[PDB]
Structures are given as C-alpha cells and as structure tokens.
Design a binder for this molecule. Structure first.
Ligand SMILES: Cc1cc2nc3c(=O)[nH]c(=O)nc-3n(C[C@H](O)[C@H](O)[C@H](O)COP(=O)(O)O)c2cc1C
Lengths: 166, 162
C-alpha cells in the first residue's frame, strides 16, 4: 500500500463536497494584528484537556498572524451569520477591519475576537504548529468558552450553505 | 489554564459533525467505529486526519494495520451509526453485519451506499493526551449521489438535504 498513488486532487475535492462541515469563523488578535477567516477544517481532539485543531491554508501568508499571536478563537456560526461567513471567506472583498465591523465582538481569555450570538466559541492558546503540505495545522488548548441557545447551525455541504435546526 | 471538560463537551454539542464510520482491516483484525472527530487536512496530496480515543484499547488496530477508510454516512445510516458507536452493544462482527461492504485500495471495509468513502494509508500517528491523531493519505475513493447527509448536532441525529 506504500507504493500506490494517492487519488487526484479534483476527484478528492468532489468527494469532499459530500462531507458536511459546521461553519466557523476563526479569529486572532495580538502583536501581529487582528485577523479572521471562515473555516470548516477543524475538529475536537480531546476533552481532557480540551483541545481543538484548525487547518489554515499556507498560500495565504496572512495566516501566519495566528501562529505569531499564539492564540485563536473558533466561533461556531448560527442561522443569522451568512453575511459574516461571506465576509470572512473573502466573497465580498473588504479589509479585515471592514469585515469585523459587520458584527459585534467581545473577548473571553486570550483577546481573540469572540462573536456575540455564536452557537459556541472556543478561545484557545496554540500548543502545536504543524506543516502538512498545503496547510498549517494548529492545535489549541481551550482556555475560554461560551455557548448560546441559537435555533439553527450554519453548515456547508454540496458547495452551498445550509441551516440546520438544533 | 484550560476550561472544564464537561463545559467543553456541552459547548461542543452546538458544533455539528458529519457522521462517519471509520474502518480498518488487516493482520490485526477488522474494526469500525462511529466518529465525527475528523477533517480534511490537504487536497495535495489528499490527506485526512482522525482522532481515536485511547480508552478504547482496540483502536490500536487502526495503528497496527496502518490503513483506514472513512465512510461518510447518508440518511438511512442512523441505526448503523448507533451500532458503531458502541451504545447498543453487539460485537464488531455483529455491527458489520448490519450493512454491505466492499474494498477499494487498502482492504479496509468501504460502506456500500455511503455518501463518500476515503480509503487511506496511515502516514503519521501522534499522541495527544487522551487520543491518537492519525494522518492518512487517500489512495482510494468512492462517492454516491445520496439525497441526505447524516449529521450529529445537539445530542441528536439529523438528516440534511444536499
Ligand atoms: C465554507 C468555506 C470553508 C472554508 N474553510 C477553510 C479552512 O478550513 N481553512 C482555510 O484556510 N480556509 C478556509 N476557507 C477559505 C478562507 O475563508 C479564505 O481563504 C480566507 O477568508 C481568506 O480569503 P481572502 O484572502 O480572499 O480574503 C473556507 C472558505 C469557505 C467559503
């Protein structure tokens, strides 16, 4: 099995279009500045201690800001957050500052922007930074937490956004 | 410096997950389990990670075999997900009996009728507290045009139209 080729990137992306993802906006703030981006490549690693990972495209050099600040917050998006998901995916242009202006943010522990009205927010300190081909994989220990009882979760699946009732 | 485990788990119930069954086969035996702690790492080369609890000793079988298939579940797969979660008993063989399986590249069981299946060779195994994190390169692929995805959210299964 070590000698066989990996599948084609296109075929893989097409298959991954069948793999739903809860839409997050991952954020950071600190000496390197404030940045956010719409993200689905994240998951929980452990509950003890609470640890989550995110995958950031290397091709966008501004993603280094997360590493430099050594903190990030994962904000789980709800029904009313389509505009924000679009802003933070680069769909509508705008500067980072202009993108943040579109909603109200607060903080938990690290200073990374936490979305008011998020389904959940996980505020993290970076504990591992890894290079995996096209992406940095950052592991974070969860040092701040919020959750709110919103009616719907924002989910990406089959190349479009969906709202799913909790 | 970290938050409480329970509070974290509770917050994570607001974080939806596409339900997968991850499987393996080889010299160490055949094993499957339901999970949502997986994501795509890269498309070049196609790479996926999975997180496996240490407490379930037999998860070592994935590491020993060095292959796994991630099967993305569709609408009709709720009972199957329940079986492979260990929450309704049954031996491994009894769990596999509840569905039809095939092979792609590695010999790991691939689910017939899955929305997608990603057949992987393990390229890295990492230890992270209570879990192993396995990185797999995708060497086999299947995809089917099923109408709904099985999603876990708010401690319940959901069906989401594609
Ligand atoms: C639904 C969706 C999911 C995304 N997931 C990720 C991700 O997992 N990791 C990542 O680095 N970028 C992801 N992106 C892309 C980033 O949002 C985007 O690269 C970032 O906002 C910077 O875009 P810009 O330079 O055009 O402003 C995703 C985009 C969308 C629309």
């Amino acid at each position: 099995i070590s000698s066989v080729s990996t599948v084609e990137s296109k075929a893989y992306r097409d298959a991954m279009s069948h793999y739903a993802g809860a839409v997050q906006i991952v954020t950071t703030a600190g000496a390197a500045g404030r940045r956010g981006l719409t993200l689905t490549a994240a998951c929980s690693v452990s509950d003890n201690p609470p640890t989550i990972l995110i995958c950031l495209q290397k091709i966008h050099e501004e993603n280094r800001i997360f590493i430099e600040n050594g903190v990030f917050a994962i904000n789980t998006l709800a029904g009313p957050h389509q505009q924000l998901a679009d802003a933070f995916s680069g769909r509508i242009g705008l500067t980072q500052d202009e993108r943040f202006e579109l909603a109200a943010w607060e903080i938990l522990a690290t200073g990374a922007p936490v979305l008011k009205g998020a389904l959940a927010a996980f505020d993290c300190r970076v504990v591992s930074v890894q290079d995996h081909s096209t992406h940095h994989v950052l592991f974070g220990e969860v040092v701040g937490l919020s959750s709110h009882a919103e009616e719907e979760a924002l989910i990406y699946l089959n190349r479009r956004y969906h709202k799913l009732e909790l």
